[PDB]
């Protein structure tokens, strides 16, 4: 019992603060900030986390000499071979640390290091879900890209407190070599952009929200922090807050001990530029350039930090790094800023409501905890669980739900408004994060995040867990929803294993992948063709590696990568036709705005409809949409108001659900439709169940018919396409874009203070296929593209489906109109609907398609 | 230097335990960095109200225990 624990403790890096204290703190909530460090690709959030880790610990095991010197990063939370070999932090491989503040109020923080790269929004999403605060991190230079804006938007929704980290100041000092004034201007611009992206809150260096950082060198400061270190000496305590306030913005300070008049005389350089940025610049120059002795003297005088004898014999980048670490101390400022940001706990309730419906909690009688993500921290599986309320002890006998079954549960509860516990679990070991170890603990508590070893057998992906002791408690309980994995998947990898003897193994691995990588729809289709919707290419590759090395360990084939296509109409329907073995339906494509709204109480609904698409009152009355796909169902005949046969809709819509799930043409889901009932020819003899069953087929058929009528189409998706190219290489990029079929430049934005042209675009996900690689080869190591699908924007595959003339070449890519059909046919073939090397598509029923639509 | 965080107690009735083993009641209307209290009036603890609104000095306050949760 104890011996094992001791052993575990031993196999671990000894922390500078006592872990006992941290544990004690964790027993109390409000002393636990859960922080998602998040940002764009290569923000240097992982690096930042590394710095924090370093600060925490005395000596790390695999911290090499080079890394110590400050050459390579030691991305302490990169962990698994995949990530260190690849360059990208890939999974949410976080850490827990006590951190003192300016005014040393310790607080046990549960950092979770997101992945930047856009095809891992899954992990980012998870982090967001977990973490009540989020350190957004930004490259100075790359600026507030669209990705960052998106993140901000989808952190307001969650919701969360948004500290920012303007990371990579070194880049503007040394790479861009901006003057100090210019740098300041750039920073201001960035701040403005951030504010714009935000709705409610204003962010600035004052009020502790911006955290200026350069993790390469490894300094973070906030302005308050700076003041504490280096401007208590020279000012009386009472006027320190005021000074801090002055520091940011359009403010100047002339020779006057101690005023500080806003504006102004002769030589400019503002307060921020004079008292911060300029100082930093000087430090940099001196660190690199100056006679070392003089620098040392300066640092004795102006900072009271001593360049050691061993440190003096360093090389520049290392020396500079050392200097900056000496200056701005083990990063307390950041922690302070974080603390300031997190309200706290006004937000928290709201966040929890968002996660799992509004209501009221129950502290003593039960515990509940969001099982957020399965992981593979210490080889074996754990569930990264956040305990929201109660305290979850080791060995405890526990309830659970995969949030596939959450909505259903809620519905059941509502209906209710015996004691059946559907699954269960025995909590083997509970631990903390992180990076390169799992500190084990007997008790998990309300507030804090943990890894839990007993959980995994029951759940897949999102999950809740609970431990009630009543009926009342059960009633009170709610269930976290599945996490809006902001990106969504779009990218098919169709698997065969090479030796189909070893399909079981693959299946086992596949389940693991599903669990472990949570942004992956694994469809196992009827033919034997397994299918994997990745977010994108890199993510997919990573997943493959994980499967094809660790979890499966088998030789495994792969297809040229495809998409999902979804069904939609262009024009409206024309003639309803009820089928027998008796109901008829017809669909119009809904307004684009409405669709967009959907992508992002009856009277209320009606009002909303009116606001959106100018729907009448009758239309409002009729509505009943479904699936979050989306398609919209409308009960809009005449007799329906008299009829109670059209009433009992709850039964009727089952067919609709099915239809939406798998459309006619693709056998692949419908999208962007307003379905409308026209007639429901129900006979006199009921047999209610039988009737219901009939409806369940018939409705689908009706829907299909409607789709056919309305001039249907496959909808391909479009990747929104960030490209951060070098200015004079934009023509090349344009050419590249032109070269392929779907491709469009929606704007070319100038990233201020850089040579970068942030050119947002759109590209369809079958046209994507390695596009990043193409971009990077062509552009000669410039223009780090990204592709992503935050929006859920689809488009017309350009042409008319249902044409046997179609195309010429089997082997080649087909022309655009032709392609409109070709994809559909191929999809059908894949599904196993058409039978043969050559075939066609047509819709029954009936009467020979009404005599070929009356010729 | 810092403001007394009594924004939770704003517009709620409070038992102001005051100097010399005395008491005051009343709904909280305002305060400052010295912990003076401005409150819409109530009784001195059987019982008898004086005033429409009242102001208690900072020094005088032992405690301000919340009557409402």
């Amino acid at each position: 019992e104890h011996t094992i624990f001791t052993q575990l403790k031993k196999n671990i890096p000894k922390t500078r603060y006592n872990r006992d204290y941290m544990l004690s703190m964790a027993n109390i909530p409000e002393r636990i900030i859960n922080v998602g460090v998040i940002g764009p690709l290569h923000s240097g959030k992982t690096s930042l986390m590394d710095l924090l880790v370093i600060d925490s610990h005395k000596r790390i095991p695999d911290m090499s000499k080079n890394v110590e010197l400050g050459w390579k990063p030691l991305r302490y939370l990169d962990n698994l071979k995949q990530e260190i070999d690849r360059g990208l932090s890939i999974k949410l491989n976080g850490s827990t640390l006590l951190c003192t503040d300016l005014e040393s109020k310790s607080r046990m923080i549960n950092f979770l290091d997101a992945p930047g790269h856009v095809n891992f929004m899954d992990e980012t999403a998870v982090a967001l879900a977990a973490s009540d605060l989020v350190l957004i991190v930004i490259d100075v230079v790359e600026g507030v890209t669209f990705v960052v804006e998106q993140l901000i938007k989808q952190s307001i929704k969650n919701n969360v407190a948004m500290c920012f980290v303007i990371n990579k100041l070194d880049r503007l000092i040394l790479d861009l070599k901006l003057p100090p004034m210019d740098a300041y201007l750039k920073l201001n611009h960035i701040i403005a952009n951030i504010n714009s992206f935000t709705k409610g809150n204003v962010f600035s260096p004052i009020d502790n929200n911006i955290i200026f950082a350069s993790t390469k060198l490894g300094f973070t400061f906030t302005i308050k922090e700076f003041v504490s270190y280096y401007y208590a000496h020279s000012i009386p305590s009472s006027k320190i807050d005021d000074f801090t306030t002055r520091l940011w913005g359009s403010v100047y300070y002339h020779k006057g001990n101690f005023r500080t008049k806003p504006f102004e005389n002769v030589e400019k350089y503002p307060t921020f530029v004079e008292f911060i940025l300029i100082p930093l610049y000087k430090i940099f120059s001196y660190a690199l350039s100056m006679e070392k002795d003089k620098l040392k003297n300066l640092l004795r005088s102006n900072f009271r930090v001593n360049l050691s004898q061993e440190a003096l014999q360093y090389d520049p980048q290392p020396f500079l790094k050392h200097v900056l670490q000496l200056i701005f101390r083990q990063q307390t400022g950041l922690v302070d800023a974080i603390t300031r940001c997190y309200q706290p706990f006004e937000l928290f309730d709201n966040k929890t409501a968002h996660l799992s419906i509004p209501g009221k909690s129950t502290p003593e009688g039960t515990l509940w905890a969001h099982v957020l993500k399965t992981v593979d921290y210490g080889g074996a599986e754990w569930s990264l669980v956040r305990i929201y309320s109660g305290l979850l002890k080791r060995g405890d006998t526990v309830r659970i739900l995969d949030t596939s079954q959450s909505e259903s549960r809620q519905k059941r509860q509502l209906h209710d408004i015996s004691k059946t516990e559907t699954p269960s679990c025995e909590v083997e070991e509970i631990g903390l994060l992180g990076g390169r170890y799992v500190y084990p603990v007997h008790e998990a508590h309300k507030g804090q995040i943990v890894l839990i070893k007993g959980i995994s057998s029951a759940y897949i992906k999102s999950a809740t867990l609970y431990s009630v002791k009543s009926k009342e408690d059960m009633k009170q309980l709610k269930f976290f929803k599945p996490l809006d994995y902001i990106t969504e998947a779009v990218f098919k990898i169709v698997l065969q294993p090479l030796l189909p003897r070893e399909l079981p193994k693959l299946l086992d691995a596949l389940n693991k992948i599903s669990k472990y990588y949570p942004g992956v729809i694994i469809k196992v289709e009827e033919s034997g063709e397994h299918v994997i919707l990745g977010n994108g290419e890199l993510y997919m590759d990573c997943l493959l590696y994980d499967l094809r090395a660790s979890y499966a360990k088998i030789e495994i084939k792969i297809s040229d990568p495809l998409t999902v296509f979804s069904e939609s109409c262009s024009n409206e329907s024309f003639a309803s036709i009820p089928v027998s073995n008796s109901i008829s339906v017809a669909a119009e494509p809904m307004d684009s705005k409405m669709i967009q709204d959907l992508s992002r109480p009856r009277k209320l609904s009606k009002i909303l409809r009116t606001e959106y698409g100018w729907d009448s009152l009758a239309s409002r009355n009729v509505w009943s949409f479904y699936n979050g796909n989306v398609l919209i169902n409308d009960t809009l005949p005449d007799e329906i108001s008299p009829e109670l046969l059209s009433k009992y809709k709850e039964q009727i819509i089952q067919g609709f659900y099915w239809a939406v799930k798998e459309g006619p043409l693709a056998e692949e889901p419908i999208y962007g439709v307003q379905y409308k009932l026209l007639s429901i020819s129900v006979p006199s003899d009921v047999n209610i169940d039988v009737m219901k069953s009939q409806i369940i087929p018939l409705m689908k058929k009706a829907c299909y018919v409607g789709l056919l009528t309305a001039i249907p189409i496959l909808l391909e998706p479009i990747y929104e396409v960030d490209i951060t190219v070098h200015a004079p290489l934009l023509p090349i990029v344009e050419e590249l874009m032109k070269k392929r079929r779907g491709s469009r430049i929606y704007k070319t934005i100038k990233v201020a203070g850089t040579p970068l042209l942030e050119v947002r675009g759109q590209v369809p996900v079958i046209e994507s296929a390695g596009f990043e690689t193409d971009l990077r080869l062509s552009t000669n190591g410039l223009g780090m593209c990204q592709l992503y699908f935050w929006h859920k924007i689809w488009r017309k595959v350009p042409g008319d489906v249902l044409d046997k003339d179609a195309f010429i070449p089997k082997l080649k890519p087909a022309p655009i109109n032709s392609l409109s059909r070709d994809f559909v046919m191929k999809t059908r073939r894949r599904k196993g609907i058409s039978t043969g090397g050559f075939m066609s598509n047509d819709g029954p029923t009936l009467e020979k398609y009404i005599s070929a639509e009356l010729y | 230097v810092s403001t007394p965080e009594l924004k939770k107690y704003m517009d709620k009735k409070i038992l102001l335990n005051i100097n010399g083993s005395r008491k005051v009641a009343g709904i909280l209307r305002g305060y400052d960095i010295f912990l003076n209290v401005v409150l819409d009036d109530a009784m001195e603890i059987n019982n008898h109200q004086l005033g429409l609104q009242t102001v208690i000095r900072g020094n005088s306050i032992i405690s301000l225990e919340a009557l409402d949760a």
Binding site: - | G30, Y31, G51, Q53
Partner: protein, 75 residues
């Protein structure tokens, strides 16, 4: 929010029946009309009246009661 200074100012503007309590002195109270204002709680209060508390009235002129020994105000 209505700060204490603001309240005091308002009272001054009004000229209303103010009843002051003494710090660490139960038995006595003051009753008058606020005339002055200071950075501290100190004020001048013309037409004041000393009161023995109910466990009547007593004669008293114009007075400034010092801010340190104030307790209650009402106006």
């Amino acid at each position: 929010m209505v700060p204490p200074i603001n309240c005091i100012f308002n009272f001054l503007q009004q000229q209303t029946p103010v009843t002051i309590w003494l710090f660490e002195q139960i038995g006595i109270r003051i009753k008058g009309k606020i005339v002055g204002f200071d950075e501290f709680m100190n004020v001048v209060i013309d037409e004041a009246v000393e009161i023995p508390v109910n466990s009547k009235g007593t004669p008293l002129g114009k007075i400034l009661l010092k801010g340190d020994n104030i307790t209650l105000i009402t106006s």
